[PDB]
Amino acid sequence: KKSRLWVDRSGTFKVDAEFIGCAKGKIHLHKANGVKIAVAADKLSNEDLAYVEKITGFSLEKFKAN
Numbered sequence: 001k002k003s004r005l006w007v008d009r010s011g012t013f014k015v016d017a018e019f020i021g022c023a024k025g026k027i028h029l030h031k032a033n034g035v036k037i038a039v040a041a042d043k044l045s046n047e048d049l050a051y052v053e054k055i056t057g058f059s060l061e062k063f064k065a066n
Contacts, residue, residue, distance in 0.1 A: 003032035007045045
């Protein structure tokens with residue numbers, strides 16, 4: 001795990017970020033730019049979820065749209 005390029009489901013936004021904590025279905029992210037953001041884990045890309053799954057130990061399969 002390290003500050004990397006995250007992408008949402010639709011590919012509308014891509015962000016450099018590291019995973020800090022996921023809560024209430026959202027992901028708290030700390031960008032490598034030094035900014036802290038909140039990205040919903042359910043409108044995100046499967047790869048990004050698979051990664052945060054590995055950080056957490058949970059499964060975001062349910063959050064993957066396809």
